[PDB]
Amino acid sequence: QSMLWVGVVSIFPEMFRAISDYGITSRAVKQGLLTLTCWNPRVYTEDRHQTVDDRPFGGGPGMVMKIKPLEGALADARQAAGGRKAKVIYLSPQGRQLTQAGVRELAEEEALILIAGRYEGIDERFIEEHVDEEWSIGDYVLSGGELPAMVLVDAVTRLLPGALDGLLDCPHYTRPEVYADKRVPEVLLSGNHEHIRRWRLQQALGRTWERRADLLDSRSLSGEEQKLLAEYIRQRD
Amino acid sequence: SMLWVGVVSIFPEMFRAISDYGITSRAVKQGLLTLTCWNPRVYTEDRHQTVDDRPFGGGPGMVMKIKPLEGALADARQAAGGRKAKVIYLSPQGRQLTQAGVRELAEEEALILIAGRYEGIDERFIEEHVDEEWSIGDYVLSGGELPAMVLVDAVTRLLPGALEEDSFTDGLLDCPHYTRPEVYADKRVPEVLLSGNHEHIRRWRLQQALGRTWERRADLLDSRSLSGEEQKLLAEYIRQRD
Ligand SMILES: NC1CCN(Cc2ccc(CNC(=O)c3csc4nc[nH]c(=O)c34)cc2)CC1
Ligand SMILES: C[S@@+](CC[C@H](N)C(=O)[O-])C[C@H]1O[C@@H](n2cnc3c(N)ncnc32)[C@H](O)[C@@H]1O
């Protein structure tokens, strides 16, 4: 069957058409590399207008997603995963910050159940009991976990065999050779494979040093890379 | 509308994820947000051209051409009218998005977002037209559509009438939340939330926020220092945690 099974618990399963119908995620679903399923907590409640949230204990603004509707959707999702070891992830701004290293780790799992919260969040007792890991996509607050869950699925899907450094990328250029007073660097126009590979690596090193030096501190630079970086720095105005 | 957003993307219909659901949908209905899309594929030189061409100097993948991006941008700039529109390219090379950045972006009257695919756009388009480059985090995605939506959602939350004290607001993670029932499967709601006054609840919530930030995101504490009262609440959380 599929290389990676993903079950999403969300009150907006339709939002997930952004990944089921587009790009590498759509391709992986078609190619059978990825199985994507949704589980609306709104169908694991017992009322006419379908409610998932209740007021927070201790007062304050907003509402909190109840334990029962989430436990419903989770149990159903766990059953459909079958004999796969499924890691339960809650998407949250309190979680561990997602990075490419984390993406690689998540890509090694055979099944993921992603919980997309809404409102002020979900009842802490649901988290303590059922959530294996909490993950954040960045230091900003969103209205729900759906876009984060999709960002996670997209990043992980890229790493699946058949779907498709610690440095920023080099600039890219395409047709035409000259466009409104701006011209393409000559090394890409007629240079050799080593001339282009050295220029691209130097531009990548240079751009990382300018904008994301923290990425260089973590990284291990070779003698050749130290020379290309030094050169980029002393040759710019 | 309070905020006008134009998105430049080869997949405008992916944006139904924000135009039809959640707070972004409500803001579009309430007229607080205007959301429009601009497909570069309809701005090619001729209908037989793709948006992308092969990269100069070889290597894997394709690169989005300047000409379609420029047509989509000029058209979006015209529809923005008399609004000062900030041009944003969503990119993993950009400035990392944070709640502080979202607040700054929320003060703009118009935004024009540029979303490219996995192989990137021509540097000359960026140099010439892009006002700001923003990344949503240190991970690699297949395109800028999900990042552009993450940005619109974060900014929309700050619009008056769309929904002030949550995670990264004051440099702290949030406290845990609890709802009905009082006891669920051998687990009970903290007593202070059932029987405490407003000051008891405030100190407990602040203490939980400080302890959770100290446990998971101590970097946030380094930036945002701690007052005397907060140091005492945190010292107490640490010694009583287990
Ligand atoms: N063959 C090369 C491999 C690296 N590529 C760099 C690159 C360019 C664009 C993307 C697509 N990502 C985004 O558009 C994006 C936009 S915002 C964002 N934030 C975090 N991560 C992201 O990937 C993004 C991914 C990688 C260029 C082609
Ligand atoms: C308004 S937020 C709740 C934020 C609140 N400060 C809390 O206690 O987590 C609603 C939901 O969106 C998701 N979410 C918000 N920002 C996120 C982020 N940066 N990363 C991951 N998920 C996020 C979570 O699933 C969260 O339950």
* Residue positions counted in chain A: 237
Judge residue A22's burial from the number of C-beta atoms within 10 Å of its C-beta, 0-12 exposed, 13-18 middle, 19 or more buried. Answer: buried
Backbone angles phi, psi at A86, to 5 degrees: -95, 125
Beta bridge partners, B110, equal: B4, B85
Cβ within 8 Å of residue A42, ≥6 positions away: A11, A50, A52, A69
Return the active site residues of B. 92, 119, 157, 166
Instruction: Write out the residue limits of the CATH 3.40.1280.10 domain(s) in chain A.
Output: 1-164
Q: Which amino acid is at A234?
A: R
Cross-chain residue pair A207–B128, CB shorter than 8 Å: no
Instruction: Write out the residue limits of the CATH 1.10.1270.20 domain(s) in chain A.
Output: 165-237
Q: Of A18, A88, A172, A89, which Cα lies nearest the Cα of B142?
A: A18
Q: Which CATH number is associated with domain B1-165?
A: 3.40.1280.10
Spatial separation of the C-alpha atoms in residues B121 and B103, rounded to whole Å: 27
Q: Of B126, B56, B57, which Cα lies nearest the Cα of B90?
A: B126
Q: Chain B within 8 Å of A184 (Cβ-Cβ)? A: yes
List, in sequence order, every beta strand (DSSP E) within chain B: 3-8, 33-38, 52-53, 63-64, 85-96, 110-114, 132-135, 183-184, 187-188
Say whether A233 counts as a known binding-site residue: no
Query: Tokens 């899907």 — which residue?
Result: A157
Q: CA triplet B136, B138, B140: central angle to 5 degrees?
A: 85
The topology (CATH level 3) of A165-237 is Trp Operon Repressor; Chain A (1.10.1270)
**DSSP state letter for B176:** P
Spatial separation of the C-alpha atoms in residues B125 and B153, rounded to whole Å: 26
Q: Which amino acid is at A12?
A: F
Residues 111-170 (A) with a CB less than 8 A from some CB of B: 120-125, 127-129, 137-144, 146-148, 150-151, 154-155, 157-158, 168-169
HEC string of chain A equals CCCEEEEEECCCHHHHHHHHCCHHHHHHHHCCCEEEEEECHHHCCCCCCCCCEECCCCCCCCCEECHHHHHHHHHHHHHHHCCCCEEEEEEEEEEEECCHHHHHHHHCCCEEEEEECECCCEEHHHHHHHCCEEEECCCCCCCECHHHHHHHHHHHHCCCCCCCCCCCCCCECCCCCEECCEECCHHHHHCCHHHHHHHHHHHHHHHHHHHCHHHHHHCCCCHHHHHHHHHHHHCCC
Instruction: Write out the residue limits of the CATH 3.40.1280.10 domain(s) in chain B.
Output: 1-165
Spatial separation of the C-alpha atoms in residues B195 and A50, rounded to whole Å: 30
Query: Tokens 């996995």 — which residue?
Result: B118
Q: Which amino acid is at B61?
A: G
Q: Which CATH number is associated with domain B166-242?
A: 1.10.1270.20
Nearest ligand to the C-alpha atom of residue A98: 2
Most informative mutation of A22, A147, A169 for ligand 1 (most atoms within 8 A of CB):
A169
User: Are A170 and A203 spatial neighbours (Cβ–Cβ below 8 Å)?
Assistant: yes
Query: Tokens 């710019």 — which residue?
Result: A236
What tokens appear for A140 in the block?
């900003």
Nearest ligand to the C-alpha atom of residue A139: 2
User: Are A138 and A153 spatial neighbours (Cβ–Cβ below 8 Å)?
Assistant: no
Torsion, CA B58, CA B61, CA B62, CA B64, rounded to 10: -120
Helix B145-157 and helix B22-29: axis angle, to 10°? Answer: 60
Q: Which amino acid is at A27?
A: R
Q: Please give the CATH superfamily to which domain A1-164 belongs.
A: SPOUT methyltransferase, trefoil knot domain (3.40.1280.10)
Instruction: Write out the residue limits of the CATH 1.10.1270.20 domain(s) in chain B.
Output: 166-242
Q: How many CB pairs under 8 A join A and B?
A: 243
What tokens appear for B224 in the block?
């945002």
Among the partner residues B120, B141, B193, nearest to A172 by beta-carbon distance: B120
Say whether A137 counts as a known binding-site residue: yes
Cross-chain residue pair A54–B123, CB shorter than 8 Å: no
| CA diameter of chain B | 71
